[PDB]
Coordinates of C-alpha atoms in Angstrom, one line a residue:
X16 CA -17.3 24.9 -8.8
X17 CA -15.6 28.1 -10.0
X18 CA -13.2 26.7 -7.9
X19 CA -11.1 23.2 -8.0
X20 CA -11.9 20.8 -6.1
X21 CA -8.8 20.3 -4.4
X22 CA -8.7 23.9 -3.2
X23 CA -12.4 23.4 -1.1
X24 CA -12.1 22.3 2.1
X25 CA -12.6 18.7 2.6
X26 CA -15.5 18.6 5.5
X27 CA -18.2 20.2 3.0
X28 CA -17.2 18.4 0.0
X29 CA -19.4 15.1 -0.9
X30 CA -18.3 11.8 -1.9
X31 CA -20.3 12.5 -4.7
X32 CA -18.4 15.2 -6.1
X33 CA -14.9 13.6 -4.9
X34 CA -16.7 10.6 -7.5
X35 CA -17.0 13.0 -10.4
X36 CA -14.2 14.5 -9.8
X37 CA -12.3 11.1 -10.2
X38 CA -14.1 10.2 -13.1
X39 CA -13.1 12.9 -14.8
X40 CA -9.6 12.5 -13.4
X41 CA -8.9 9.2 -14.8
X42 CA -11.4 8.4 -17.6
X43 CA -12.8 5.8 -16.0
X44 CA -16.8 4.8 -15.3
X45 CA -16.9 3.6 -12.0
X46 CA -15.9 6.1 -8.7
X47 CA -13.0 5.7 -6.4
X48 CA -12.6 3.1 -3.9
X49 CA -11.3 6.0 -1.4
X50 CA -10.4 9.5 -1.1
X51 CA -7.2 11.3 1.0
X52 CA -7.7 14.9 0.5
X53 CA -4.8 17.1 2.5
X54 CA -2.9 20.5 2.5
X55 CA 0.6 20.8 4.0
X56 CA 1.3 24.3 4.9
X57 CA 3.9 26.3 7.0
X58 CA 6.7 27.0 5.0
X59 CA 6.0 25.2 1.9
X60 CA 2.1 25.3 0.9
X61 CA 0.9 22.7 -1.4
X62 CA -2.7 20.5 -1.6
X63 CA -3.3 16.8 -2.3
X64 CA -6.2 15.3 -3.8
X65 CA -5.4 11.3 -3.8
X66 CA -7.9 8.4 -4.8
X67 CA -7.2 4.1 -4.6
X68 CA -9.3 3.3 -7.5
X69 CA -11.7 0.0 -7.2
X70 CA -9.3 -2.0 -9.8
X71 CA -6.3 -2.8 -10.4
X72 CA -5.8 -1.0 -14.2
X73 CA -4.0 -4.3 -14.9
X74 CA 3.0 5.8 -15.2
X75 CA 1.6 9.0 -15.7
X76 CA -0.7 8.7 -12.6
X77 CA -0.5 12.0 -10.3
X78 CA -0.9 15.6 -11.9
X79 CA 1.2 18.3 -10.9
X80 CA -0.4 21.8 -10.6
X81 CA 1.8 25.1 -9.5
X82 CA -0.5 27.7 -8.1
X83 CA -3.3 25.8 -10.2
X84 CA -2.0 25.5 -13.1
X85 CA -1.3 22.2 -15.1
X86 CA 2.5 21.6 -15.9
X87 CA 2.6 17.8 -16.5
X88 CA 1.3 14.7 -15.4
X89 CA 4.9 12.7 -15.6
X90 CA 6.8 14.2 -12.3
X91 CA 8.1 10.7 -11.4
X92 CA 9.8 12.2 -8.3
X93 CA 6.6 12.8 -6.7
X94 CA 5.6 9.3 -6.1
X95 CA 7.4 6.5 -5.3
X96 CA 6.6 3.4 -8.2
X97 CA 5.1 0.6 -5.8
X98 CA 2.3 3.2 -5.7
X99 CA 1.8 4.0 -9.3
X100 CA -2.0 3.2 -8.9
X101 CA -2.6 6.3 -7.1
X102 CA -4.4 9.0 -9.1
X103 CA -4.5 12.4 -8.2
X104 CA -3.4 16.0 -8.4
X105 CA -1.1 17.6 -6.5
X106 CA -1.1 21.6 -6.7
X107 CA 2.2 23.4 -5.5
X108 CA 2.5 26.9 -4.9
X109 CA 6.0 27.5 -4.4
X110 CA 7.5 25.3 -7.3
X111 CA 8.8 27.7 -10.4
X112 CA 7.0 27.6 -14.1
X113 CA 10.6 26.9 -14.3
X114 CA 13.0 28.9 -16.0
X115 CA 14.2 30.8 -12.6
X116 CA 17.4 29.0 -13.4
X117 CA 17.1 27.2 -9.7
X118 CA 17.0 23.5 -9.7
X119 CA 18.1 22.0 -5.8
X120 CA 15.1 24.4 -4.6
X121 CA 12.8 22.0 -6.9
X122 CA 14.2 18.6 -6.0
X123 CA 14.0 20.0 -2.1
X124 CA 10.4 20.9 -2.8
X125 CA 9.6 17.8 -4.6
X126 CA 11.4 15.6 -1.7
X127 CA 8.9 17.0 1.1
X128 CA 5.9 16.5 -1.1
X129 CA 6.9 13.0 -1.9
X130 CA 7.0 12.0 1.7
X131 CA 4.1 13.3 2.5
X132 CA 1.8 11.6 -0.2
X133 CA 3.7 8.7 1.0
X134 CA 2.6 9.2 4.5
X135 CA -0.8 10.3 3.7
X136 CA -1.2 7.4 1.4
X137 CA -0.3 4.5 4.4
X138 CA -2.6 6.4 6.4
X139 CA -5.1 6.0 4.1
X140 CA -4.3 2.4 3.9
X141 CA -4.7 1.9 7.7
X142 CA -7.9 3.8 8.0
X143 CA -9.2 1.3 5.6
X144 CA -8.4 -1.5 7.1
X145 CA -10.0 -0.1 9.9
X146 CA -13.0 -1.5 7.9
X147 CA -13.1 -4.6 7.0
X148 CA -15.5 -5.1 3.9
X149 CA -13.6 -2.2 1.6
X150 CA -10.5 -3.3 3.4
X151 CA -10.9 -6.4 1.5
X152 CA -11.7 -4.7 -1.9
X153 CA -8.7 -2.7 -1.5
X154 CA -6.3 -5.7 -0.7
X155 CA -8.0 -8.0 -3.6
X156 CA -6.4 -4.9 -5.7
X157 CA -2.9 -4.1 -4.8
X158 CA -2.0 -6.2 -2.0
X159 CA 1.1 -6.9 -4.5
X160 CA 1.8 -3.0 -4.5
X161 CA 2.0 -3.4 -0.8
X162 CA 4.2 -6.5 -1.3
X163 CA 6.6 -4.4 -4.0
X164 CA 6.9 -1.7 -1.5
X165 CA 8.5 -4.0 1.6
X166 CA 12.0 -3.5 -1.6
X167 CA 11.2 0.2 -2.6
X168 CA 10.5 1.6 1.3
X169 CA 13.0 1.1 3.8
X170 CA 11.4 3.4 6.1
X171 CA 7.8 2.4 5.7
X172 CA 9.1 -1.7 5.5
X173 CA 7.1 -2.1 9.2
X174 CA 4.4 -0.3 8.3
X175 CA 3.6 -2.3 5.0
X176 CA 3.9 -5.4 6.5
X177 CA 1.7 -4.9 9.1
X178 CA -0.9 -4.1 6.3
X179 CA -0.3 -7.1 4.7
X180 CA -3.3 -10.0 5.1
X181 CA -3.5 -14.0 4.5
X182 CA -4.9 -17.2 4.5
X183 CA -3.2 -19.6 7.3
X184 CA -4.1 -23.2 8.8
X185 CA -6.2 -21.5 11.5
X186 CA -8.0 -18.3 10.0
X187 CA -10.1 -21.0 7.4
X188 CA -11.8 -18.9 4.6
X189 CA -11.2 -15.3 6.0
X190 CA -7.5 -13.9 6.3
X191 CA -5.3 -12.8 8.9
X192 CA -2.1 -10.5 9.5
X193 CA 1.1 -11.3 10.6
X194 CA 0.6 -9.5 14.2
X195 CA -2.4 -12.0 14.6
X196 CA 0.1 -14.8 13.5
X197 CA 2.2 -13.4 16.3
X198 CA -0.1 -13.2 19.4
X199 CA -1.6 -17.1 18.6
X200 CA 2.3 -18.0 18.7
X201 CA 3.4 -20.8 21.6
X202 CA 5.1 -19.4 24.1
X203 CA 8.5 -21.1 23.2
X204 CA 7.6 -20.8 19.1
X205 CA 10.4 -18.7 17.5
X206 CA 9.5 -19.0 13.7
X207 CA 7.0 -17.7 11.4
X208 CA 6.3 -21.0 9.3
X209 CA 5.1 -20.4 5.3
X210 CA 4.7 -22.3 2.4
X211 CA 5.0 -20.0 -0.8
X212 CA 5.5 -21.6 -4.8
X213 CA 2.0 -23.2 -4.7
X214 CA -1.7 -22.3 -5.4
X215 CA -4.6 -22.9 -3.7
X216 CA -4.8 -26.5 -4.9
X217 CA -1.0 -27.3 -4.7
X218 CA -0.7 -26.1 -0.7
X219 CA -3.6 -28.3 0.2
X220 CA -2.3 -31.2 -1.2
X221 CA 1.6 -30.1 0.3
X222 CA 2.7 -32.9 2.7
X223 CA 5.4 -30.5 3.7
X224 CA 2.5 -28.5 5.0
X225 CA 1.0 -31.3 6.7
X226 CA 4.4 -32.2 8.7
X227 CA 4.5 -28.7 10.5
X228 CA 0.4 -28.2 11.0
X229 CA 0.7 -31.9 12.5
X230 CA 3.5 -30.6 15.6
X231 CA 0.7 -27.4 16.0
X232 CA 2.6 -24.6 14.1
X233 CA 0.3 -22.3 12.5
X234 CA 1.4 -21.9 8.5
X235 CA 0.8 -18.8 6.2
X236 CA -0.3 -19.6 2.9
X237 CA 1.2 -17.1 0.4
X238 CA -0.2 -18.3 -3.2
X239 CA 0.7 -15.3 -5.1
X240 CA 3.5 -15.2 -7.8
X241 CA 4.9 -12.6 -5.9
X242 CA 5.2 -14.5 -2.6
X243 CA 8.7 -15.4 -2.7
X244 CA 10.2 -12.0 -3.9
X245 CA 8.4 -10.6 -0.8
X246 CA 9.4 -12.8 2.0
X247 CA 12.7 -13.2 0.6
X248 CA 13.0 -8.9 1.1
X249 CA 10.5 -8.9 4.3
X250 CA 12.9 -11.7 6.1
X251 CA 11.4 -11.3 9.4
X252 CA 8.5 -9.8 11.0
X253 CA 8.8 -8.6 15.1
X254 CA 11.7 -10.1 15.5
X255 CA 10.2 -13.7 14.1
X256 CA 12.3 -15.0 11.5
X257 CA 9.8 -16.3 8.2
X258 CA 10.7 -20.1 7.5
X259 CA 9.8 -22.0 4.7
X260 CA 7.6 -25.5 5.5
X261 CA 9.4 -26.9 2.3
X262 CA 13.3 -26.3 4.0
X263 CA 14.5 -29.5 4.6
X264 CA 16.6 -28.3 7.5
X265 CA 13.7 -27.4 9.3
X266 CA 14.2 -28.3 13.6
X267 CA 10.4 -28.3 15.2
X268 CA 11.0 -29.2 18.9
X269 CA 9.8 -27.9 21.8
X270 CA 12.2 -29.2 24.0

């Protein structure tokens, strides 16, 4: 307590207290959805204390501490924006207070902490969906944020779309990714098929839909808003290019 939180070590702090600590963080009256808690260290020391909230709020999201104390909560640069729902505090000790008259060193500084909570936070992301239930919870939330970042992250493009879930003609009520998609593929099947533009009662009642499912080819049902923008930046997915059941060019043989 006399000390913060974020300086403790993780392995004898309780969920509990990570709670609190959230709930004072954000002002907000239920406790996080999940916790990344990490120090990078070595030639640059800084410590992370990163929480998914349960909802989606629906900018000024991670605090920035040098050698514990609070300078502002609007670095932009520390965060990329497809993950503006992440709250926390990040606590720096080699950043200046700043008038040393230095401003590469900063940017530098700022760089390596960026990519880190980036990295921590998709590791985060896959350890949840490690688990199904939460998983769930957490996709219900920002499953669009995911989608947002396939145009923001070049470098993490693979990784996002692996964590990204949906309703098809063969997984029924539950969801599915697109590396399932890929291993029920037929052997000579070269094309992810979708059907995006429609909601739940719209797709069902799609005849273009109908005319692929009939032949055997598994269709993803993408009936968010955002569906288009993100298959139109995603393209493909392992090689599989994503193709629209509605394209009236579409070629289905087998031959």
């Amino acid at each position: 307590k006399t000390k913060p939180i974020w300086t403790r070590n993780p392995d004898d702090i309780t969920q509990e207290e990570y709670g609190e600590f959230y709930k004072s963080l954000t002002n907000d009256w239920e406790d996080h959805l999940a916790v990344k808690h990490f120090s990078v260290e070595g030639q640059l020391e800084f410590r992370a204390l990163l929480f998914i909230p349960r909802r989606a709020p629906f900018k000024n999201n991670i605090k920035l501490y040098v050698r514990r104390v609070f300078i502002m909560d609007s670095c932009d640069e520390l965060i990329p924006e497809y993950l503006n729902f992440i709250r926390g505090v990040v606590d720096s000790e080699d950043l200046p207070l700043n008038i040393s008259r230095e401003m590469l060193q900063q940017s530098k500084i700022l760089k390596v902490i960026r990519k880190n909570i980036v990295k921590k936070c998709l590791e985060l992301f896959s350890e949840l969906a490690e688990d199904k239930e939460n998983y769930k919870k957490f996709y219900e939330a920002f499953s669009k944020n995911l989608k947002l970042g396939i145009h923001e992250d070049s470098t993490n493009r693979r990784r996002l779309s692996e964590l990204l879930r949906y309703h098809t003609s063969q997984s029924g009520d539950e969801m599915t990714s697109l590396s399932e998609y890929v291993s029920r593929m037929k052997e000579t099947q070269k094309s992810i098929y979708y059907i995006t533009g429609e909601s739940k009662e719209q797709v069902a009642n799609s005849a273009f839909v109908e005319r692929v499912r009939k032949r055997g080819f598994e269709v993803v049902y993408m009936t968010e808003p955002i569906d288009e923008y993100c298959v139109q930046q995603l393209k493909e997915f392992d090689g599989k290019s994503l193709v629209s059941v509605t394209k009236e060019g579409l070629e289905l043989a087998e031959n």
